[PDB]
Amino acid sequence: DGVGSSSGNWHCDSQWLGDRVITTSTRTWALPTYNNHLYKQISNSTSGGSSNDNAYFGYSTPWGYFDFNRFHCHFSPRDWQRLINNNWGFRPKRLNFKLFNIQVKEVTDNNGVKTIANNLTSTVQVFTDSDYQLPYVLGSAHEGCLPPFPADVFMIPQYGYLTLNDGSQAVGRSSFYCLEYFPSQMLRTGNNFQFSYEFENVPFHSSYAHSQSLDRLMNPLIDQYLYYLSKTINGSGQNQQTLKFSVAGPSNMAVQGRNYIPGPSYRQQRVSTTVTQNNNSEFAWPGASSWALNGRNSLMNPGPAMASHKEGEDRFFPLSGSLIFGKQGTGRDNVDADKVMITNEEEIKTTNPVATESYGQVATNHQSAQAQAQTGWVQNQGILPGMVWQDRDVYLQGPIWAKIPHTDGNFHPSPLMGGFGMKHPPPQILIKNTPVPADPPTAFNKDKLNSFITQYSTGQVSVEIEWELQKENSKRWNPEIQYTSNYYKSNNVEFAVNTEGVYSEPRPIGTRYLTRNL
Amino acid sequence: DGVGSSSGNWHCDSQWLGDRVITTSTRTWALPTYNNHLYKQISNSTSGGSSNDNAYFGYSTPWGYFDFNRFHCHFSPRDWQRLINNNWGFRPKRLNFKLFNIQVK
Amino acid sequence: DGVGSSSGNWHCDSQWLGDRVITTSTRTWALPTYNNHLYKQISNSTSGGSSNDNAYFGYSTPWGYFDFNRFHCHFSPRDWQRLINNNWGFRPKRLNFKLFNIQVK
Amino acid sequence: DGVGSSSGNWHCDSQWLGDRVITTSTRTWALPTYNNHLYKQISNSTSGGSSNDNAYFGYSTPWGYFDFNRFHCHFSPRDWQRLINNNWGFRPKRLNFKLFNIQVKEVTDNNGVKTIANNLTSTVQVFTDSDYQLPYVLGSAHEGCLPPFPADVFMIPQYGYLTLNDGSQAVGRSSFYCLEYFPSQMLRTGNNFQFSYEFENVPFHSSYAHSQSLDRLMNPLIDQYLYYLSKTINGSGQNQQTLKFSVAGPSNMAVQGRNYIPGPSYRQQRVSTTVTQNNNSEFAWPGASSWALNGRNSLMNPGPAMASHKEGEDRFFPLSGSLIFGKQGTGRDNVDADKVMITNEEEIKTTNPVATESYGQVATNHQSAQAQAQTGWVQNQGILPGMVWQDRDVYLQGPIWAKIPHTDGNFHPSPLMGGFGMKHPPPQILIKNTPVPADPPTAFNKDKLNSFITQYSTGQVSVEIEWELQKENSKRWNPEIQYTSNYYKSNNVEFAVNTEGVYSEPRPIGTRYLTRNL
């Protein structure tokens, strides 16, 4: 429109209908100039990397991008509490995104002092990768998302991508992408940008915990009509071999026939938070479970959805089997256990195997009069017919969605870090300040200009997402477990600001508090 | 239009139809003041030339000009590869040119 | 039709449309008499096999069969090159099969 | 149709309308099996060639082809005489082609004796290269065309083609063509084949000889209003330099100004048919004019249309400047001059330069008091503005058309051997006997069959061409030169059969007997 007219209003609210909840969040953003308007080839050689497992090749772009792939970007703690305490499931339906109130500033430095002024004629470029023609980086748990607290002003992260690499070198199959080779809208201070997105059909997330275990689905009062081999010898010596059979009933539930079995496994090492119970050696990387791709080892992290620990074993965790969040103010490198928040998936112990245990035991030989029957620990077990399992729970500060890789085949493409897997997720939204050259020389020079006016941009961003709800219809008589704040007095209110205005999330919040039968 | 409204968008893409390919390219340009707004007579004497074969007479103008008479101004390397590997011939048909987002400093 | 009239023509060509390619291939075949018009029980004993892993039981029929389950039966090397250099994917859609110009000797 | 019904009639006649003549010719052909149904790579190594100039690479196909690219295939000698004596020009308009009365035979050899029988169920395959996707070999003066005499039965020539070569080896750019990769009609004894072709617009062939010379177009009674420098010195000593000018008139026609000049040249060596006037040395290849392409020298043959000889110099010919036809029964290698028929282009001496002379003389220096004026013989001269020329004449036994090479540029694409140049000439008509395998083994073998029944095919071929005529409207008073037979008694009639039934063409017949002004 014009310089003196706002191009949008501040929309931040949650609307709770019967089967739907609409979340709207608005944030103020700041966008600097990245790479001084240049594309730069990057690799482990440029960053000084040495290990083969961490070698990479890619490019850093002068473009930024908007990321809102975390639940706290849309749900307040109270809204999250309502969702998790009142619904058996939820899923995103549609998306509305807006950029408005664009403000481009120029910075001039004379001598140790910088002056900031408006540049009303400068432009900012925005476009969406609706055709998914660029590498998708929103599927990784990267920082730079919209802040959970609406009053926080955030910096737009720089967009970068990786391609095929051989050490620090590239190959002929490696791809280079120029983001200026895409049509993009150019916005001055009076212009705004908006688009709508429809989520593809995804299953409802399981925001419930099973009230039954897979091995306890039988009637505890009635025998089965099936038999089991109870004895093989002749009880109370030589030549004592005689078959025996008994009815599988309530007294021996472990041997009853069952139609379904727990889901797959890939065993993790077990770590205690009581440090003196751990071995006196360096076992992080060495002791960890991993997978290999083209000679590179990548940590199995977080891996298959598996129960974090056995009942009562709360002190133990799988070495890389769980999402680890950092508390407010936590450092980047080598922080103590009290500075991080270790999530756990104990709710899925009713259907999923324990991460630090074998799947089970399997026969490994043919027993005879000369050879005793032998069994072997199944340390990893693939998908088998009749298996059932629960996916990893999602969290308030955890990811929402991920892009399913474009491959010939996949199985249960639920993101392993939690969330909704989609072939066509919300498109990447890329933003960049248009370069403004400084005064050029009065004589023609064919070289590209390298002198630009120092600029940055700021504005507001709004994203509205409609969520579909799956209401609970339980006939359970006793009250359910519910997420609740603690009344006991404390220096600060949980999920609030401190005396210095710092917002903090004191704990990870899952979604599985209500219960339903298996 | 106005100071605070963009006069055009960034269009840079290639569209491949059956018998036609449409190339669009957008660039950012900078234009200084040439000859301090003056027309100047130029010659090999003004530039110090001596040889008869390189003697010339002309004028330098304060005007600039836009030139896109090179194939890489319109075709990306991948588009060029497609064109050369899949076609026995090609020729230009029509042209569209735009200047927008003027900023004078 | 008749003895002196051909029952079909030689069709062997590839037609490249926008999103579709139609491949046609014609070949000359010869069919002898198999097993002297008999069905015969066959096994690894009849062929002299001894290993358990290669033991088998079956029948050999006096019938022949037409097989075109290889890509080079339909795509020339140039057509294959075009397909692989210009397309992200392909799949068969429909089939037409013909036998003609029968000659029994 | 059926075995016992003819699929076509014998059509061989010429119909003379006002401005059009329609020629129809029917011939009986025989088609054997070529290369035993195989494609074979051929090169100068396979044929034993050694010279770089004659090196080649290509393929020989089992297909034959029909060729009617010679005028005597359509015009009888009497029709040719009428055409050349009554018309100033002619050009082909449209084409009709027919194959019918197909007869396929099988040959069986027991012991030194062969038995031939019909194979009523066998097929012959025919198709036309209407899209010009195969190498065009009809543009070369190859043998194998339809015989001039309708009663002669001819053998179908085998189709072969050449591609890019480096010595006897091929390169990556070389192309291999499979003629079975084309849709073709399969014909039994009851079937027939036919198609129609329309000639693209071509200029009328010049079937006239100019009655004026390019240097004698002025009025012989009137002076020009232009002057010439007659003298430079001071006639009848030193210091005698004085300019002079005179009117160019009838007394000095050589110096008159002229608007047009004779056409281009590329000088040929001069050979006498009186052998004792030639040099006592071997000068064929060495003394010949040539052009070079990629390091290979190709004889300039016949080259630019140039007058064969000066007036009265009938004994001389240009070393490779003229079409040479062989008399009936003439051998293939090293025949005497009386066994061949040397064509001449003396009719174009009025506009085209003499093949064995320089184009002219050009100044090569600046004359002065110290240096005498110098001139140099122009041995070859390219196209210049104002040039006019006549193309090479066509002959009864000479070629009709040729395919203009598909190139970015060309100039006056009239075939240098004579005829009509076309981007889309009459398409190649390719024919092959369908292989008929012998008895295969009773056990499956994956190798391609190499045992086939010995077969050949025979039938009739008809081609009808409509020619447009350009009538003469001359006001010449005296009678014209006309082609005529000689009444004087002879043992045989010219253009007739001998006592052994051998048809012969005793002389080449041009088209340029009538006259018109320049």
PDB file of C-alpha atoms in Angstrom, chain D residues 286-375:
ATOM      1  CA  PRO D 286      48.696 -35.212 -60.371  1.00  0.00           C
ATOM      2  CA  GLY D 287      47.619 -32.674 -63.018  1.00  0.00           C
ATOM      3  CA  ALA D 288      43.934 -32.772 -62.016  1.00  0.00           C
ATOM      4  CA  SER D 289      42.093 -30.018 -60.160  1.00  0.00           C
ATOM      5  CA  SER D 290      40.854 -31.109 -56.701  1.00  0.00           C
ATOM      6  CA  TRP D 291      39.277 -29.920 -53.453  1.00  0.00           C
ATOM      7  CA  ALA D 292      40.105 -31.054 -49.912  1.00  0.00           C
ATOM      8  CA  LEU D 293      37.814 -32.001 -47.024  1.00  0.00           C
ATOM      9  CA  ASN D 294      39.182 -33.038 -43.611  1.00  0.00           C
ATOM     10  CA  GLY D 295      42.522 -33.955 -45.161  1.00  0.00           C
ATOM     11  CA  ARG D 296      40.986 -36.016 -47.983  1.00  0.00           C
ATOM     12  CA  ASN D 297      41.401 -34.887 -51.590  1.00  0.00           C
ATOM     13  CA  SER D 298      38.406 -35.372 -53.884  1.00  0.00           C
ATOM     14  CA  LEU D 299      38.680 -34.838 -57.658  1.00  0.00           C
ATOM     15  CA  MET D 300      36.942 -31.657 -58.972  1.00  0.00           C
ATOM     16  CA  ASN D 301      34.564 -33.763 -61.086  1.00  0.00           C
ATOM     17  CA  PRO D 302      32.663 -32.570 -63.065  1.00  0.00           C
ATOM     18  CA  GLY D 303      32.959 -29.223 -61.138  1.00  0.00           C
ATOM     19  CA  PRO D 304      31.421 -25.793 -62.056  1.00  0.00           C
ATOM     20  CA  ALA D 305      29.432 -25.581 -65.328  1.00  0.00           C
ATOM     21  CA  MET D 306      32.106 -24.253 -67.768  1.00  0.00           C
ATOM     22  CA  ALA D 307      32.445 -24.344 -71.560  1.00  0.00           C
ATOM     23  CA  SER D 308      34.276 -27.530 -72.517  1.00  0.00           C
ATOM     24  CA  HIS D 309      36.407 -25.910 -75.228  1.00  0.00           C
ATOM     25  CA  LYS D 310      36.974 -22.745 -77.342  1.00  0.00           C
ATOM     26  CA  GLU D 311      35.363 -22.449 -80.795  1.00  0.00           C
ATOM     27  CA  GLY D 312      36.876 -24.965 -83.199  1.00  0.00           C
ATOM     28  CA  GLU D 313      38.930 -26.741 -80.454  1.00  0.00           C
ATOM     29  CA  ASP D 314      36.725 -29.899 -80.470  1.00  0.00           C
ATOM     30  CA  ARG D 315      39.751 -32.285 -80.048  1.00  0.00           C
ATOM     31  CA  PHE D 316      40.454 -30.958 -76.517  1.00  0.00           C
ATOM     32  CA  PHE D 317      38.570 -31.743 -73.276  1.00  0.00           C
ATOM     33  CA  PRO D 318      38.966 -30.704 -69.585  1.00  0.00           C
ATOM     34  CA  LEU D 319      40.699 -33.525 -67.627  1.00  0.00           C
ATOM     35  CA  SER D 320      37.672 -33.999 -65.269  1.00  0.00           C
ATOM     36  CA  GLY D 321      35.251 -31.230 -66.458  1.00  0.00           C
ATOM     37  CA  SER D 322      32.663 -33.320 -68.383  1.00  0.00           C
ATOM     38  CA  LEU D 323      30.404 -36.328 -67.948  1.00  0.00           C
ATOM     39  CA  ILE D 324      31.874 -39.486 -69.495  1.00  0.00           C
ATOM     40  CA  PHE D 325      29.477 -42.247 -70.528  1.00  0.00           C
ATOM     41  CA  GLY D 326      30.479 -45.739 -71.593  1.00  0.00           C
ATOM     42  CA  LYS D 327      29.367 -47.310 -74.847  1.00  0.00           C
ATOM     43  CA  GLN D 328      27.461 -50.586 -74.835  1.00  0.00           C
ATOM     44  CA  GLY D 329      29.749 -53.466 -73.903  1.00  0.00           C
ATOM     45  CA  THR D 330      32.543 -51.186 -72.665  1.00  0.00           C
ATOM     46  CA  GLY D 331      34.737 -52.678 -69.959  1.00  0.00           C
ATOM     47  CA  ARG D 332      35.122 -51.386 -66.431  1.00  0.00           C
ATOM     48  CA  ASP D 333      38.856 -50.631 -66.205  1.00  0.00           C
ATOM     49  CA  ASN D 334      41.291 -48.881 -68.560  1.00  0.00           C
ATOM     50  CA  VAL D 335      39.282 -48.683 -71.768  1.00  0.00           C
ATOM     51  CA  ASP D 336      40.321 -46.700 -74.825  1.00  0.00           C
ATOM     52  CA  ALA D 337      38.894 -43.301 -75.807  1.00  0.00           C
ATOM     53  CA  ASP D 338      36.745 -44.880 -78.566  1.00  0.00           C
ATOM     54  CA  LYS D 339      34.975 -47.037 -75.943  1.00  0.00           C
ATOM     55  CA  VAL D 340      33.568 -44.012 -74.062  1.00  0.00           C
ATOM     56  CA  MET D 341      31.377 -41.045 -74.981  1.00  0.00           C
ATOM     57  CA  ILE D 342      32.784 -37.662 -73.858  1.00  0.00           C
ATOM     58  CA  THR D 343      30.007 -35.082 -73.362  1.00  0.00           C
ATOM     59  CA  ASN D 344      30.702 -31.409 -74.034  1.00  0.00           C
ATOM     60  CA  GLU D 345      29.109 -28.137 -72.918  1.00  0.00           C
ATOM     61  CA  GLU D 346      30.050 -25.912 -75.863  1.00  0.00           C
ATOM     62  CA  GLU D 347      26.530 -24.438 -75.909  1.00  0.00           C
ATOM     63  CA  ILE D 348      27.224 -22.438 -72.724  1.00  0.00           C
ATOM     64  CA  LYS D 349      30.329 -20.725 -74.136  1.00  0.00           C
ATOM     65  CA  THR D 350      28.197 -17.588 -74.604  1.00  0.00           C
ATOM     66  CA  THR D 351      27.903 -17.004 -70.835  1.00  0.00           C
ATOM     67  CA  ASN D 352      30.251 -19.403 -69.115  1.00  0.00           C
ATOM     68  CA  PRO D 353      34.096 -19.201 -69.210  1.00  0.00           C
ATOM     69  CA  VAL D 354      36.218 -21.931 -70.904  1.00  0.00           C
ATOM     70  CA  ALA D 355      37.163 -24.735 -68.467  1.00  0.00           C
ATOM     71  CA  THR D 356      40.841 -24.865 -69.581  1.00  0.00           C
ATOM     72  CA  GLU D 357      41.450 -21.053 -69.624  1.00  0.00           C
ATOM     73  CA  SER D 358      41.989 -18.436 -66.888  1.00  0.00           C
ATOM     74  CA  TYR D 359      38.817 -16.444 -65.977  1.00  0.00           C
ATOM     75  CA  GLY D 360      40.726 -13.312 -66.940  1.00  0.00           C
ATOM     76  CA  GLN D 361      43.501 -10.995 -65.804  1.00  0.00           C
ATOM     77  CA  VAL D 362      43.656  -8.780 -62.716  1.00  0.00           C
ATOM     78  CA  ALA D 363      46.087  -6.014 -61.801  1.00  0.00           C
ATOM     79  CA  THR D 364      48.704  -7.073 -59.251  1.00  0.00           C
ATOM     80  CA  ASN D 365      50.637  -3.855 -58.524  1.00  0.00           C
ATOM     81  CA  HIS D 366      50.637  -0.060 -58.790  1.00  0.00           C
ATOM     82  CA  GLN D 367      52.203   1.123 -62.041  1.00  0.00           C
ATOM     83  CA  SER D 368      54.642   4.032 -61.871  1.00  0.00           C
ATOM     84  CA  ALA D 369      57.565   5.594 -63.717  1.00  0.00           C
ATOM     85  CA  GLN D 370      59.809   2.916 -62.167  1.00  0.00           C
ATOM     86  CA  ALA D 371      57.502  -0.137 -62.193  1.00  0.00           C
ATOM     87  CA  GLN D 372      55.692  -1.463 -65.255  1.00  0.00           C
ATOM     88  CA  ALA D 373      52.049  -2.428 -64.825  1.00  0.00           C
ATOM     89  CA  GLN D 374      51.679  -6.095 -63.889  1.00  0.00           C
ATOM     90  CA  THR D 375      48.740  -8.474 -64.260  1.00  0.00           C
TER      91      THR D 375
END
